[PDB]
Amino acid sequence: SGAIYVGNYRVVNRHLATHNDWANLVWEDSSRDLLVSSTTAQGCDTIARCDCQTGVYYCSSRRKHYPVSFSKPSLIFVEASEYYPARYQSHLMLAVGHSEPGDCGGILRCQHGVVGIVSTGGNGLVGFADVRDLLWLDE
Numbered sequence: 001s002g003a004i005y006v007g008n009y010r011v012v013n014r015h016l017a018t019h020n021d022w023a024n025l026v027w028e029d030s031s032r033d034l035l036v037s038s039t040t041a042q043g044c045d046t047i048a049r050c051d052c053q054t055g056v057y058y059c060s061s062r063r064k065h066y067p068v069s070f071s072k073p074s075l076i077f078v079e080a081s082e083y084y085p086a087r088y089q090s091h092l093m094l095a096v097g098h099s100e101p102g103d104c105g106g107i108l109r110c111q112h113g114v115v116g117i118v119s120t121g122g123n124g125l126v127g128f129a130d131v132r133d134l135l136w137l138d139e
Ligand SMILES: C[C@H](C(=O)N1CCC[C@H](C(N)=O)C1)c1nc(F)ccc1Cl
Pocket: 015, 033, 078, 081, 083, 084, 089, 099, 100, 101, 102, 103, 104, 119, 120, 121, 122, 123
Protein backbone atom coordinates (compact mmCIF):
# COMPACT_ATOMS: atom_id res chain seq x y z
CA SER A 1 0.00 0.00 0.00
CA GLY A 2 0.96 3.65 -0.34
CA ALA A 3 0.15 6.94 -2.06
CA ILE A 4 1.72 10.27 -3.20
CA TYR A 5 0.05 13.43 -1.81
CA VAL A 6 0.80 16.54 -3.95
CA GLY A 7 -1.35 19.68 -3.91
CA ASN A 8 -5.02 18.61 -3.92
CA TYR A 9 -4.21 15.20 -5.49
CA ARG A 10 -3.69 11.64 -4.18
CA VAL A 11 -1.80 9.27 -6.59
CA VAL A 12 -2.31 5.52 -5.96
CA ASN A 13 -1.95 2.22 -7.87
CA ARG A 14 -5.15 1.90 -9.92
CA HIS A 15 -5.58 -1.75 -8.79
CA LEU A 16 -5.55 -0.59 -5.10
CA ALA A 17 -7.87 2.46 -5.49
CA THR A 18 -10.67 2.65 -2.91
CA HIS A 19 -14.41 3.42 -3.37
CA ASN A 20 -13.59 6.99 -2.18
CA ASP A 21 -10.77 7.34 -4.79
CA TRP A 22 -13.21 6.43 -7.59
CA ALA A 23 -15.89 8.81 -6.17
CA ASN A 24 -13.35 11.68 -6.30
CA LEU A 25 -11.71 10.59 -9.62
CA VAL A 26 -9.51 13.08 -11.48
CA TRP A 27 -7.70 10.72 -13.94
CA GLU A 28 -6.97 7.02 -14.36
CA ASP A 29 -5.02 4.87 -16.84
CA SER A 30 -5.24 1.07 -16.73
CA SER A 31 -2.23 0.78 -19.08
CA ARG A 32 -0.08 2.62 -16.47
CA ASP A 33 -1.70 1.14 -13.27
CA LEU A 34 -2.28 4.73 -12.03
CA LEU A 35 -5.25 6.55 -10.54
CA VAL A 36 -5.38 10.14 -9.22
CA SER A 37 -8.17 11.34 -6.91
CA SER A 38 -8.93 14.78 -5.41
CA THR A 39 -8.31 15.68 -1.75
CA THR A 40 -9.68 18.39 0.55
CA ALA A 41 -6.36 18.82 2.43
CA GLN A 42 -3.10 20.09 0.83
CA GLY A 43 -0.53 17.33 0.31
CA CYS A 44 2.93 16.72 1.80
CA ASP A 45 4.99 15.71 -1.40
CA THR A 46 7.26 17.24 -4.39
CA ILE A 47 7.38 15.49 -7.84
CA ALA A 48 10.82 15.12 -9.49
CA ARG A 49 11.12 16.67 -13.00
CA CYS A 50 14.35 15.03 -14.18
CA ASP A 51 15.91 12.10 -16.05
CA CYS A 52 17.48 10.31 -13.02
CA GLN A 53 17.96 6.55 -13.38
CA THR A 54 19.11 6.00 -9.73
CA GLY A 55 17.13 6.53 -6.52
CA VAL A 56 15.87 4.97 -3.27
CA TYR A 57 12.58 3.08 -2.75
CA TYR A 58 10.64 2.02 0.32
CA CYS A 59 10.02 -1.76 0.61
CA SER A 60 7.22 -2.47 3.11
CA SER A 61 7.93 -6.26 3.12
CA ARG A 62 11.38 -5.49 4.63
CA ARG A 63 10.51 -2.23 6.52
CA LYS A 64 13.57 -0.78 4.73
CA HIS A 65 14.69 1.59 2.00
CA TYR A 66 16.99 0.28 -0.77
CA PRO A 67 19.06 2.10 -3.44
CA VAL A 68 18.24 1.13 -7.09
CA SER A 69 19.44 1.64 -10.66
CA PHE A 70 16.28 1.56 -12.91
CA SER A 71 15.47 1.53 -16.61
CA LYS A 72 13.87 4.49 -18.41
CA PRO A 73 10.01 4.42 -18.55
CA SER A 74 8.93 1.92 -21.22
CA LEU A 75 6.27 -0.59 -22.41
CA ILE A 76 6.81 -3.89 -20.55
CA PHE A 77 4.81 -7.12 -20.78
CA VAL A 78 3.09 -7.95 -17.45
CA GLU A 79 1.56 -11.42 -16.83
CA ALA A 80 -2.15 -11.77 -16.05
CA SER A 81 -3.16 -11.19 -12.41
CA GLU A 82 -6.47 -11.00 -10.54
CA TYR A 83 -6.55 -7.27 -11.45
CA TYR A 84 -5.63 -7.24 -15.15
CA PRO A 85 -5.36 -9.61 -18.13
CA ALA A 86 -1.86 -10.17 -19.63
CA ARG A 87 -0.95 -6.81 -21.25
CA TYR A 88 1.81 -4.26 -21.86
CA GLN A 89 2.07 -1.78 -19.00
CA SER A 90 3.39 1.63 -20.21
CA HIS A 91 5.64 4.14 -18.36
CA LEU A 92 7.13 1.27 -16.28
CA MET A 93 10.71 1.28 -14.92
CA LEU A 94 12.42 -1.95 -13.76
CA ALA A 95 15.22 -2.46 -11.22
CA VAL A 96 16.92 -5.26 -9.30
CA GLY A 97 15.51 -5.22 -5.75
CA HIS A 98 13.19 -7.16 -3.47
CA SER A 99 9.41 -6.78 -3.84
CA GLU A 100 6.19 -8.68 -3.01
CA PRO A 101 2.59 -7.75 -4.15
CA GLY A 102 1.82 -5.79 -0.95
CA ASP A 103 4.82 -3.52 -1.66
CA CYS A 104 2.78 -1.67 -4.35
CA GLY A 105 2.49 2.01 -3.45
CA GLY A 106 5.99 2.34 -1.95
CA ILE A 107 7.63 5.56 -3.16
CA LEU A 108 10.77 5.73 -5.37
CA ARG A 109 12.61 9.08 -4.81
CA CYS A 110 15.73 10.71 -6.25
CA GLN A 111 17.46 13.93 -5.03
CA HIS A 112 14.82 15.98 -6.95
CA GLY A 113 11.66 14.45 -5.46
CA VAL A 114 9.19 11.64 -6.00
CA VAL A 115 9.83 9.62 -9.18
CA GLY A 116 7.12 6.95 -8.99
CA ILE A 117 5.50 4.13 -6.99
CA VAL A 118 6.02 0.33 -6.86
CA SER A 119 3.59 -1.34 -9.32
CA THR A 120 5.09 -4.75 -10.39
CA GLY A 121 7.84 -7.21 -9.41
CA GLY A 122 9.06 -10.75 -8.81
CA ASN A 123 12.20 -12.94 -8.72
CA GLY A 124 14.47 -10.20 -7.41
CA LEU A 125 12.93 -7.48 -9.59
CA VAL A 126 10.85 -4.42 -8.68
CA GLY A 127 8.91 -2.26 -11.17
CA PHE A 128 7.86 1.37 -10.68
CA ALA A 129 5.09 3.36 -12.38
CA ASP A 130 6.67 6.71 -13.39
CA VAL A 131 4.84 9.94 -12.45
CA ARG A 132 7.47 12.54 -13.63
CA ASP A 133 5.73 13.22 -16.95
CA LEU A 134 2.40 14.22 -15.23
CA LEU A 135 3.10 17.93 -15.23
CA TRP A 136 -0.42 18.83 -14.15
CA LEU A 137 0.16 17.31 -10.66
CA ASP A 138 1.72 20.65 -9.50
CA GLU A 139 0.88 23.14 -12.26
C1 LIG B 1 2.39 -10.51 -9.05
C2 LIG B 1 2.72 -9.08 -8.62
C3 LIG B 1 2.65 -8.16 -9.82
O1 LIG B 1 3.64 -7.86 -10.44
N1 LIG B 1 1.42 -7.70 -10.19
C4 LIG B 1 0.15 -8.02 -9.50
C5 LIG B 1 -0.64 -6.77 -9.16
C6 LIG B 1 -0.86 -5.90 -10.40
C7 LIG B 1 0.49 -5.59 -11.05
C8 LIG B 1 0.32 -4.75 -12.31
N2 LIG B 1 0.86 -3.54 -12.26
O2 LIG B 1 -0.22 -5.21 -13.32
C9 LIG B 1 1.25 -6.88 -11.40
C10 LIG B 1 4.08 -8.99 -7.92
N3 LIG B 1 4.82 -10.10 -7.81
C11 LIG B 1 5.95 -10.01 -7.14
F1 LIG B 1 6.63 -11.18 -7.03
C12 LIG B 1 6.47 -8.88 -6.57
C13 LIG B 1 5.71 -7.73 -6.71
C14 LIG B 1 4.50 -7.79 -7.39
CL1 LIG B 1 3.53 -6.35 -7.52
